[PDB]
Design a protein around this ligand. Sequence first.
Ligand SMILES: Cc1cc(CCCOc2c(C)cc(-c3noc(C(F)(F)F)n3)cc2C)on1
Ligand SMILES: Cc1cc(CCCOc2c(C)cc(-c3noc(C(F)(F)F)n3)cc2C)on1
Ligand SMILES: [Zn+2]
Ligand SMILES: [Zn+2]
Lengths: 178, 178, 29, 29, 29, 285, 285, 252, 252
Amino acid sequence: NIGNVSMYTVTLSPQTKLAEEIFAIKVDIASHPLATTLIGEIASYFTHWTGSLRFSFMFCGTANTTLKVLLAYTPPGIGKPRSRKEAMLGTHVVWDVGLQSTVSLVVPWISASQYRFTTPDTYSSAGYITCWYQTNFVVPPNTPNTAEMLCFVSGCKDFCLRMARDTDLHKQTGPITQ
Amino acid sequence: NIGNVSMYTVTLSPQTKLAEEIFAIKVDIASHPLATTLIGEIASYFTHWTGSLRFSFMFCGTANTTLKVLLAYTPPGIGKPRSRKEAMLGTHVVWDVGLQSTVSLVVPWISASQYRFTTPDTYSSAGYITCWYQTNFVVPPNTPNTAEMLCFVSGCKDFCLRMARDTDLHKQTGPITQ
Amino acid sequence: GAQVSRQSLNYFNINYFKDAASSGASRLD
Amino acid sequence: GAQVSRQSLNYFNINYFKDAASSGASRLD
Amino acid sequence: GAQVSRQSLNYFNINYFKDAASSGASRLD
Amino acid sequence: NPVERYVDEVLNEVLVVPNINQSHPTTSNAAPVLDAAETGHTNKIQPEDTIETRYVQSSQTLDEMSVESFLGRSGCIHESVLDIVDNYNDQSFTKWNINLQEMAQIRRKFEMFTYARFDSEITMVPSVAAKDGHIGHIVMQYMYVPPGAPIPTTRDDYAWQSGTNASVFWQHGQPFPRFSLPFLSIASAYYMFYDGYDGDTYKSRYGTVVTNDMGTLCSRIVTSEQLHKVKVVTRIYHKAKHTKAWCPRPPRAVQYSHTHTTNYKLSSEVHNDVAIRPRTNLTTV
Amino acid sequence: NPVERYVDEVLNEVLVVPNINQSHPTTSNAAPVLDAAETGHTNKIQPEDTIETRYVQSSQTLDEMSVESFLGRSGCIHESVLDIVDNYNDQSFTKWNINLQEMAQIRRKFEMFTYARFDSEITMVPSVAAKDGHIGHIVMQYMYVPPGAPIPTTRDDYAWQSGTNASVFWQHGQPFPRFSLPFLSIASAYYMFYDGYDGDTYKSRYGTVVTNDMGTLCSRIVTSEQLHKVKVVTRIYHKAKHTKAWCPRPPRAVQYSHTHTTNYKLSSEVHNDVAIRPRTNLTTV
Amino acid sequence: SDRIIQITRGDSTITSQDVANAVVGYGVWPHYLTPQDATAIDKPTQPDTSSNRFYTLDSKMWNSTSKGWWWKLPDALKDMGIFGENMFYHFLGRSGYTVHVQCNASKFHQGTLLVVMIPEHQLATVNKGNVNAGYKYTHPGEAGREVGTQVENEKQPSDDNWLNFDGTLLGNLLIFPHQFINLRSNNSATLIVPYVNAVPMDSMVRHNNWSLVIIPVCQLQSNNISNIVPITVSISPMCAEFSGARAKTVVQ
Amino acid sequence: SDRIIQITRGDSTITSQDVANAVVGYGVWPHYLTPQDATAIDKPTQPDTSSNRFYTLDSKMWNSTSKGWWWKLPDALKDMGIFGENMFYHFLGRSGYTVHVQCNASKFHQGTLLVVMIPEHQLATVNKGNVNAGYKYTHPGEAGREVGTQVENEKQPSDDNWLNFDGTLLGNLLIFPHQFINLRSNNSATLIVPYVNAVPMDSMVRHNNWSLVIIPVCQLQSNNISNIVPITVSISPMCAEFSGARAKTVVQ
Ligand SMILES: Cc1cc(CCCOc2c(C)cc(-c3noc(C(F)(F)F)n3)cc2C)on1
Ligand SMILES: Cc1cc(CCCOc2c(C)cc(-c3noc(C(F)(F)F)n3)cc2C)on1
Ligand SMILES: [Zn+2]
Ligand SMILES: [Zn+2]
């Protein structure tokens, strides 16, 4: 997908098995795939970070397509949830698709220390965001059987970066000439 | 005894000869065996010391074991006492073992100069602490015929260290690696 | 060229050269 | 950045840089 | 650390370091 | 209080972040978590709205994240080389078409904005390599030749007189030279990007090369020819002071290839050209 | 009085010790000399209670015994070596995983506390050894690469641009470089000891290596290759400023063996591994 | 009487008619995290009396050759009722403790136990280079570790009681909150310690804040050795609070 | 908009953009036990946000032949995080609930679910004399009971949805707190019920206070039957409090 707009969308569709997993990524603001987002890129210019993260999702399907999904944040000290039931026990939002296309899940700052390292460091890995089918993707007849979803990220009022450093998300391996 | 907890205890028992000597050490806060105590270790980070020292002793025998002991401090300018009578002429405390397990002997600051060197230096050697049987170690039948005693040390309100210096109670003879 | 303050905590914001470009990093907000 | 005192014995506690880390050893107690 | 005098002839006896040992030669009598 | 503000500067507590307040369970038809990204606005929902939070007094400050701080660190922008190999007259002087586009690190940071206005602090780090053993007495001359001023063509060109241009003489052994420059543009701000040309024909130039001419930095070893050959490399460092930036933009995602242009190159496997790391699949953290 | 306190600083009489008062003969059923160490408290008996003392005005001060004073002396924490032997490009730069665990003297003092919070003063002492005769013009670059920042892999790596990282350039002949660092932890204090891991499996790391990552100190000889080879050794010195310590602990009793760990080694005759000197017997002073 | 003590925590009450007073570590009584020192923003859970109660561990047998015992908190309570449940369902935990060590014999017995509470007791390994104590070994649970028994393994911690299992001399442990159980004087020790750490809350699973060390400095002796003299430990969390709820963490 | 709802409990927030308002059983909002009504004298434990959060059960599949489903509380949450742990470590428990049933389809689907919360739903057996429903059968857990599937056993409960599984007519269930999920109007149902019992607190193990019954009264129909239409249940305890702590009870 890299090098194509599709790398930005997640596909949803009618399921035959219940509570299937949709996506899963680390919450760490500077880890992949969050790294190249604007907040991830800026975070990569600092050594420390703190604060709550705001993840938003916009359903791109038809107006007649319905869906209920469960978005969960798993605080650290445990592996990523292997099931919806396991994920649901943590911080989560049940998203009902309707007139308002977008939903937001806030990943509260839940850490032992006031700050964490922006670079992938064991001690300060902040947890995961997983997405699961709460009910199912349902459509009337003669309607596309799949739909896309866009995912956004930004920081909350308490987000903050510290200790300026050079980024490793960009390099120069030769002379830049005239 | 070094390398065993027994290096910290002094054994007492019924005597057949009167006024026997129990232990004898220099009072100098940084001399051996006082050197590795916390106050001795800290004193070893300075060049000068002054003030009164507090030596305490806790009887570890049975509740039915009795004993009277004489703890003495011999100010300098004379050799360590060769007998209880000789020691008793100096600063001392007669300790009676009873409900209160611990006794304290204060070694008052008795010096020509306001301070002394912490390192073993003739001119500033502060004297000795000796311990002698005042009466005897007595027990009823069917009771262990020996008992241990623990010895403590700390400084009084007038204790003070001066002129910071590196310690010779610890070294590095090679590289400390990762 | 000193912006002497008082409080006593007397602040002394000195500009050694006669050009604005010469002074150090700016204050915030 | 001077904490000018007076008594006349005028104390001048000066902080040459704008960071707390930059100043010398702290006062006691 | 300045013992500022006045008369105007303002004397400025400054001690640059925080130790008495650091200052220069003593005054007489 | 000009003194209370002083303390905030020393402690770096000028820009404080808000506290998190205690929140409670809710049941309402007001749903903050729901919105519409189509509007182009970011949902302003905070943690107190999605979970029951406790009260917490924030102590973080945004000072270090200020534009002044982000662009206020001295970075290398040029590495001038004077290498005496076999002809002192030809090799003891050189020139550079000034620009902030040759080094990726500082270039990327400035380019995170469309326009920027700032004064500059230039610091030079000269280092004399003794190729044959000694370095003798090295004295350097750096002269700023604004566009239009005569450019020296020999180590003794009359232009080195610097009757009007600013020149800085450095003597080996003395501290690193440094000076300040006021905002230099003929416009109100420097163009980090410029979607325009210097004409209207197929041969007109495109980009910032049209608006960012800064002149030439000429330099020479003042010291006359010496027995032992040296190689003097002067590295130039730049820092922005008293800065303002406008219209933030996406960070450079691929390597730079040339100055004053956003041109880039792509390989047959584009994932190698960007910092994005291939994921095994959607659910592999 | 901010001026009376000033005098105490100059004279070092901020923390005075109490006087000894005259005491007299006593006969009472209140026995201060008797107590119970089992309680875990130290008998607070003073000399006036065990002997008849005279009155004495104390003049000693505890200033020098303060934590600020104890940990406020600059000691060596690293000895960086750049030795040009046969390949300038490979040998003219190096890196160090920063830590305060490699030199026993300052390490032991900090480790007499469980937690410590302080700012740092780093002072560098570079010395250029002329292996072949001359040293030419030596210019050094020291760059702090915080965890995450790109680490240079060649003497000309773009990272040396230091567009954001702090770098200090020193020129041989100029005074020793020095700078201050603010308390750097993501926690409220540095862990001198840490009874924890970075996971919960048999392969998780144990100790301060988990909490004390400080990044890398990269350095290079800025000067390009010279005829005569040199060996530059830069010794780094550290000092704590504005210090606070918590929970004192037993001093290191055996030699250190590795960084971030309390591990130690014992010989077949342990009395040789500790400062304790064997006594002939209980009564031999 | 100053020889008697009654400690009530939750639904538990412990007594001793021969105490040597009590110790409050660093003179700070345990208290809940305040908003000025807190960092995690979700509302904490405070089980109160269902977690702040005395939990009695497995008793140990003290004999003439015992070299000592140690436990680590909160590890030792990982399987103790509600408190234990809470330390695994949450990422963060915070707690103080009341440690009551029990040991009685007779007025014809003698022996002395040094009871210590050490903050950040980072164990060492001996003659094993930079290999450190394995997670498994510093997480023995209520069973604790019996000094001088474990059949050595590479990742096994130091078992030298005279060197505090960490390269420091035993005689100086008194600088930490402590008490002695001198059979002739008392039959118990009581230490109340507050939460101590460089962060307001922490992982109860991967960070042991306190370590309880018990070393017999004065050997157990009597003329009735057949009568077993046990040592029993009862610990009660105080102001226990947890944060960052989720599924239950499973170790190993 | 009165069609939208957001419910936040602990660290969970649930939304629905097509609700039919909400119901508060008997108009009484859940609240903690007061000292005037309490009988047990030990201080209760109140997990607060670690227990008063939404727990999502296993989803069910609704099809043209579905006869219905039922769950019992607190049984259904016996294995749900801290709440579950608390109901087994204590003798007594007390809790209210926010029950949010979820079911979406399309504007071209039709079907109607009667969602009911019954207090003391004492199940019956059919044609089996005085033999009553076995403990095992009225304690199915989060899986609940699927009407019309279970292969009959002697102690198995009545499976007649038209007789409310208890000898009363379905049409009258509306006298209990309830809502309908009429596919053409809403995609969820929300019921908030207070603690209801003849005693202030009770055994969470042997007494199920409320029963959640879901019966499709209007059959599910559409011209796209292959698209599975699930029904999902999320329940959040409210003012959960427990008393009489001890070891953890193990059932069966
Ligand atoms: C956009 C934008 C803004 C700028 C200005 C870059 C600064 O460039 C310089 C430098 C590096 C040095 C001098 C300079 N002035 O005097 C000297 C001397 F001492 F070197 F002669 N050098 C002048 C300019 C405009 O370039 N692009
Ligand atoms: C605990 C504890 C606390 C610390 C901090 C040790 C200080 O380490 C350094 C040093 C020695 C130098 C720099 C440094 N910053 O800039 C430079 C430059 F000039 F060398 F680039 N060096 C940064 C840190 C964090 O390490 N362990
Ligand atoms: Zn020469
Ligand atoms: Zn030479």
